[PDB]
């Protein structure tokens, strides 16, 4: 059954990287909003 | 230096000897003088077409000026403050002094903290702010 172990471990591979994905979207979101702030 | 320069009709440039007078006034703890002197250059300052963006921001700093005084004077000058420049509201300066307002309104000393912290965090403090802000917090 590693045969479809694989595909569990991949499933939550993607899981772990799309949450990276959010958060570096989310830090990136509070850089623009401090530097347009900083503009003015 | 700002009487000369106002007898000899060079505005704008006794204006910021005003502001200066007014900013080291305030710190000895002398109030009125300063609300004065930023009242009055805000309110000369709301009609210009260039320095209407910044007008906002000395009306904050009476208001903070003003409440060292007392709460309930610092509340019906920021209603008449907000009333006389509407768009004043749109600025977060309102919405900060809203919530530390509400905060200290029942000595909830940890919410005015968390949300100096923020403010802080989003845009650096100035020395003469952080000063006054924890001046303010001692009450």
């Keep these: 059954m590693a045969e479809d172990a694989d595909m569990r471990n991949e499933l939550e591979e993607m899981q772990r990287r799309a949450d990276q994905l959010a958060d570096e979207s989310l830090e990136s979101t509070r850089r623009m909003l401090q530097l347009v702030e900083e503009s003015k | ?139």
Aim: charged fraction near 30%; proline fraction near 1%; aromatic fraction near 12%.
């Design chain 2, 1 to 139: 230096s700002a009487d000369y320069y106002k007898g000899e009709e060079s505005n704008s440039s006794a204006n910021k000897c005003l502001l200066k007078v007014a900013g080291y006034a305030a710190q000895l703890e002398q109030y009125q003088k300063a609300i004065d002197i930023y009242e009055q250059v805000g309110t000369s300052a709301m009609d210009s077409p260039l320095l209407k963006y910044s007008a906002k921001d000395y009306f904050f700093k009476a208001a903070l000026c003003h409440f060292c005084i007392d709460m309930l004077n610092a509340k019906l000058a920021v209603q008449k403050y907000e009333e006389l420049f509407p768009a004043f509201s749109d600025s977060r300066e309102c919405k900060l002094m809203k919530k530390l307002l509400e905060a200290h309104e029942e000595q909830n000393v940890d919410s005015y903290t968390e949300s100096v912290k923020e403010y802080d965090s989003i845009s650096r403090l100035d020395q003469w702010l952080t000063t006054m802000l924890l001046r303010i917090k001692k009450t």
